[PDB]
Amino acid sequence: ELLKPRTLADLIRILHELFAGDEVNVEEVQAVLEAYESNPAEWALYAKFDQYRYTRNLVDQGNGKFNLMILCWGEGHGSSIHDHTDSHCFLKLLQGNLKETLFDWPDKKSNEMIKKSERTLRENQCAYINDSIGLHRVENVSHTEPAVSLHLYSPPFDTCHAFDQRTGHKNKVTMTFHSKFGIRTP
Ligand SMILES: N[C@@H](CSOO)C(=O)O
Ligand SMILES: [Fe+3]
User: Fold this and answer.
1) Gap from CA of 37 to ligand 1 centroid (Å)
2) Domain residue spans of the chain
3) How does DSSP assign 67-120, residue by residue?
4) What's the CATH code, domain 1-186?
């Protein structure tokens, strides 16, 4: 039975229930994430920005089944074209807007990676990606408004690949956390 999360804390409790087993009902997880109405007071602790690039701030470790984190995107900050290491990845906007550009997995032959589609993700909306859907880039294209998003990955992963848009060549990258549970983790 899926109920509306009343607060971020309630959302976390609900997620622990939805991930108690060995599989993931993607549509139910997406629905509960969408239903949580972003309340900035509840997540201010995690919203730690860096001047030069987007930051990843761990909120909950999901008793091992998932990581829930808040990403903070300065004006003009974006990601690489990347995969998600055989994990489910949910993205919900808490503040601002992000542009998501989708790409196909490259062929082994070196070639320009052409965009398959793009969309604008708006406040409170929840998107989903996995490697079977494709690769993506996420960017805050705003010149005036920082963006904040809530991300859930299951299983957790701390490495992925970044893809060179001009060739499709990939490189392994290790992901780091700017903070964990509200504490800066240099
Ligand atoms: N996967 C990127 C953010 S775009 O993914 O919903 C990251 O976790 O840093
Ligand atoms: Fe991503």
Assistant:
1) 21
2) 1-186
3) EEEEEEE-TT-BPPEE--TT-EEEEEEEES-EEEEEEPPPPSS-----EEEEEE
4) 2.60.120.10
